[PDB]
Amino acid sequence: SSFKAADLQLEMTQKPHKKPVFGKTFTDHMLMVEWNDKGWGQPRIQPFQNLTLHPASSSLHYSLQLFEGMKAFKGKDQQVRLFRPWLNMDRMLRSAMRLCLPSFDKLELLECIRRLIEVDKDWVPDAAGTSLYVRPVLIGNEPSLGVSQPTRALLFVILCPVGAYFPGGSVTPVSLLADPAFIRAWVGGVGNYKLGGNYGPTVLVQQEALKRGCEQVLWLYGPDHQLTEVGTMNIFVYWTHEDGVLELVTPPLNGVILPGVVRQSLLDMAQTWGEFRVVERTITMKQLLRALEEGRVREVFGSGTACQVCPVHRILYKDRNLHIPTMENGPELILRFQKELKEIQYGIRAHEWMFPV
Amino acid sequence: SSFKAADLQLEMTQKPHKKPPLVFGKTFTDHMLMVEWNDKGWGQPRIQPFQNLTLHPASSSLHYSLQLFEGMKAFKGKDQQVRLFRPWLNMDRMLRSAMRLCLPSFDKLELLECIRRLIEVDKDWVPDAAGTSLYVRPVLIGNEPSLGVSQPTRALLFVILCPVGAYFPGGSVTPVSLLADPAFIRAWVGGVGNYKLGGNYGPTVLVQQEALKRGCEQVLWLYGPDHQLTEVGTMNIFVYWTHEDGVLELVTPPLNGVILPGVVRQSLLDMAQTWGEFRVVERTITMKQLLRALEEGRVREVFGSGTACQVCPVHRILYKDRNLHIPTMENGPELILRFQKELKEIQYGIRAHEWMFPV
Numbered sequence: 044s045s046f047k048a049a050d051l052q053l054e055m056t057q058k059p060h061k062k063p064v065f066g067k068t069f070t071d072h073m074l075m076v077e078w079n080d081k082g083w084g085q086p087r088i089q090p091f092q093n094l095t096l097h098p099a100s101s102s103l104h105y106s107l108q109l110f111e112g113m114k115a116f117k118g119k120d121q122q123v124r125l126f127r128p129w130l131n132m133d134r135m136l137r138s139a140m141r142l143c144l145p146s147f148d149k150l151e152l153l154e155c156i157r158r159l160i161e162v163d164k165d166w167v168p169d170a171a172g173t174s175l176y177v178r179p180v181l182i183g184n185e186p187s188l189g190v191s192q193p194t195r196a197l198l199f200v201i202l203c204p205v206g207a208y209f210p211g212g213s214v215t216p217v218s219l220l221a222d223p224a225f226i227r228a229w230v231g232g233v234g235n236y237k238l239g240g241n242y243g244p245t246v247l248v249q250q251e252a253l254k255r256g257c258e259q260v261l262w263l264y265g266p267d268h269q270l271t272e273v274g275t276m277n278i279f280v281y282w283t284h285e286d287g288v289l290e291l292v293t294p295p296l297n298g299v300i301l302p303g304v305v306r307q308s309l310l311d312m313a314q315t316w317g318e319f320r321v322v323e324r325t326i327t328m329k330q331l332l333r334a335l336e337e338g339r340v341r342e343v344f345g346s347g348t349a350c351q352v353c354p355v356h357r358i359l360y361k362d363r364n365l366h367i368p369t370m371e372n373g374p375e376l377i378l379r380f381q382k383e384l385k386e387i388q389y390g391i392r393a394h395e396w397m398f399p400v
Numbered sequence: 401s402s403f404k405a406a407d408l409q410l411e412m413t414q415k416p417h418k419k420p421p422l423v424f425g426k427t428f429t430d431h432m433l434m435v436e437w438n439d440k441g442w443g444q445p446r447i448q449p450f451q452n453l454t455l456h457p458a459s460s461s462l463h464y465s466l467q468l469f470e471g472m473k474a475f476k477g478k479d480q481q482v483r484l485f486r487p488w489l490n491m492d493r494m495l496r497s498a499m500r501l502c503l504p505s506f507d508k509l510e511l512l513e514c515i516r517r518l519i520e521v522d523k524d525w526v527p528d529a530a531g532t533s534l535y536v537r538p539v540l541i542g543n544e545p546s547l548g549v550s551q552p553t554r555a556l557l558f559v560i561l562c563p564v565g566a567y568f569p570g571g572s573v574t575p576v577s578l579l580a581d582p583a584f585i586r587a588w589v590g591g592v593g594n595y596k597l598g599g600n601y602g603p604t605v606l607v608q609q610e611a612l613k614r615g616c617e618q619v620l621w622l623y624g625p626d627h628q629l630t631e632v633g634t635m636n637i638f639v640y641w642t643h644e645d646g647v648l649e650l651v652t653p654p655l656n657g658v659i660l661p662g663v664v665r666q667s668l669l670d671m672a673q674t675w676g677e678f679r680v681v682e683r684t685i686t687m688k689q690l691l692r693a694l695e696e697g698r699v700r701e702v703f704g705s706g707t708a709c710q711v712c713p714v715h716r717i718l719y720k721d722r723n724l725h726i727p728t729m730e731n732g733p734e735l736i737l738r739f740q741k742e743l744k745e746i747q748y749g750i751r752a753h754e755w756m757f758p759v
């Protein structure tokens with residue numbers, strides 16, 4: 044009921060590509076594993092190459108597709124580490140089950156990914172702010188037009204080296220368009236899984252945001268306009284709450300929120316410091332507006348594998364620009380999180396969150 | 401701006417497959433249409449042998465569901481003339497889908513001609529036995545070799561064809577049972593359930609398995625705190641009843657964002673409006689209204705509409721634990737039969753009609 048890393052077939056490349064925008068440059072090899080009625084085949088690391096798909100593949104008709112996204116970091120000691128990969132494996136499997144795609148063993152796949160990165164180790168940059176982006180994918184591959192549980196599937200992993208997210212070597216804030224007409228996900232839906240179907244529909248909304256002079260979309264939900272997510276990031280607010288208490292709040296995992304790995308790590312870190320209240324609670328636009336008027340908001344930011352932490356300085360809501368005082372406040376919490384994550388990720392501090400390749 | 405049928409290139413196949421017990425969606429004809437789009441605009445359209453697609457592993461079609469599709473039928477009449485049912489509507493709907501996903505625009509009439517040309521090449525695949533048809537499956541997908549979530553700079557439009565048998569075994573319309581569970585949501589206001597995008601279907605697979613597990617054949621998709629009946633499986637839903645105000649009516653949910661605007665659905669409203677024999681409306685329908693109408697003997701027929709079956713009677717709805725009998729079959733089903741008959745006449749050339757497009 045799962046492929047084994049022990050059965051790995053390696054096929055090194057004939058012509059290695061020469062080393063050098065996110066998501067454009069890929070490495071020499073990829074992981075591929077086929078599944079069918081006779082279960083999982085043997086995993087193989089093969090050179091990077093195209094997929095060959097039947098024109099009726101359910102991956103293309105009915106979006107039987109899911110992905111992951113995580114980063115591997117090369118520290119000063121030249122050792123490569125993945126950040127909390129076990130959580131990505133957990134989330135990938137939940138995604139798989141939701142789309143009736145075949146179950147697999149999380150440790151086997153991780154080992155296969157480790158083996159794949161081992162093989163392309165030379166691709167992992169080591170300049171400040173850089174990393175290798177790891178993109179696993181599982182797709183249905185039924186050669187029929189019936190909307191049904193696939194009897195064929197493909198799991199593959201590709202790797203993309205990436206440069207520093209903040210070019211200045213310093214966090215820079217973003218502006219958000221907050222328009223309630225666009226809804227990313229619904230209770231009872233699939234917004235809490237990393238399914239390809241959740242992203243395609245946001246492309247037009249992101250264009251609307253730029254058209255309107257904003258950089259990303261603030262996803263609102265419900266008649267009370269709950270702040271759910273920022274672009275493809277989780278949202279956090281650092282403020283003095285109504286009851287006079289300083290807290291860090293992020294929306295709870297009630298179904299419309301993608302359970303981000305960084306998000307969970309920011310909650311864990313802040314809980315560990317024990318210096319202020321850390322809570323998972325709904326956040327409405329009205330709470331935010333009242334807190335801003337009353338000078339209670341210190342920092343608003345997104346969390347995700349792309350930037351780690353992204354400051355927010357403006358929200359366009361109801362044709363009205365709300366200034367958010369994040370950068371004015373340091374941004375102290377943001378910088379503290381970035382420094383601890385950086386120290387853990389590049390091996391400056393030992394930590395069980397890191398998985399060595 | 402758009403590819404042109406004028407520039408069609410044809411590569412006839414040299415490995416024609418042996419023609420056939422037709423199971424929907426598993427048997428394909430010898431040729432396919434294929435047109436690519438990039439920064440230079442659309443390439444030349446081509447008809448070519450049926451073959452696998454080659455895709456970059458980062459293709460946005462597979463990572464961010466930049467994919468949409470259509471579904472329509474070609475019918476071979478008694479006069480052996482092959483005809484498409486209201487294809488212009490499918491073309492309109494496909495274009496709306498493409499725009500919603502920031503996929504490249506095209507000329508609806510040029511694609512239609514290219515499709516006509518393709519069916520003409522595979523004309524001998526069109527079955528002619530009663531209730532059979534040729535299923536047309538146009539697809540448009542983004543194909544950017546990049547993990548960025550953005551408007552693709554490359555896309556692929558293709559069309560494949562499938563011969564299909566009669567939906568109903570001996571021609572007799574056969575009713576279905578539905579699982580109505582509020583825990584399941586197909587689509588939401590502000591979402592994309594009203595476009596024919598691949599993303600709307602993948603999540604239904606697990607729910608359909610649950611319908612089977614619970615002894616039902618299809619899913620009755622409910623929406624909102626008031627349990628509005630929206631769609632039945634991949635079909636629009638219609639209720640024929642005497643409403644609370646004493647008026648005999650045909651009702652279907654309105655196009656308010658959670659309803660896919662079916663070609664058959666529109667055609668049924670057009671026909672029934674034309675007859676002028678009873679009220680025809682687009683209004684939400686709730687489970688509470690249905691239960692009360694069933695208790696009062698006001699329901700005559702409930703049915704789905706779609707390209708698959710045309711019109712599909714419903715005899716049972718399992719709502720939570722209650723098994724509700726729907727008396728569709730005890731009432732003829734008169735309206736269903738009348739729609740079926742009139743559509744068959746139009747579709748198989750028995751009666752020349754502006755709704756038919758000759759191949």
Ligand SMILES: O=C(O)Cc1ccccc1C(=O)Nc1ccc(-c2cc[nH]n2)cc1
Binds near residue numbers: 112205206347549
């Ligand atoms: O947005 C997220 O946090 C998650 C996500 C969800 C969905 C799709 C993609 C991503 C993602 O990781 N995109 C990504 C963009 C840019 C870079 C980058 C550029 C220079 N350094 N790093 C790294 C990752």
Ligand SMILES: O=C(O)Cc1ccccc1C(=O)Nc1ccc(-c2cc[nH]n2)cc1
Binds near residue numbers: 188634706
């Ligand atoms: O359900 C719909 O009406 C639309 C749809 C939406 C989404 C996916 C597929 C369909 C569809 O057309 N499926 C389909 C099944 C079976 C047959 C058949 C079998 C014997 N004769 N014809 C024809 C079409």
Ligand SMILES: *Cc1c(COP(=O)(O)O)cnc(C)c1O
Binds near residue numbers: 346
């Ligand atoms: C990928 C993603 C995130 C962030 O998840 P991480 O695991 O922290 O990278 C947040 N929201 C959405 C919608 C996403 O797709």
Ligand SMILES: *Cc1c(COP(=O)(O)O)cnc(C)c1O
Binds near residue numbers: 634662665
């Ligand atoms: C395709 C489809 C229909 C029916 O549309 P027709 O154009 O009548 O075939 C109904 N509902 C959903 C959800 C669909 O995908």
Ligand SMILES: [Cl-]
Binds near residue numbers: 127128129130395396
């Ligand atoms: Cl962990």
Ligand SMILES: [Cl-]
Binds near residue numbers: 486489754755
């Ligand atoms: Cl028409």
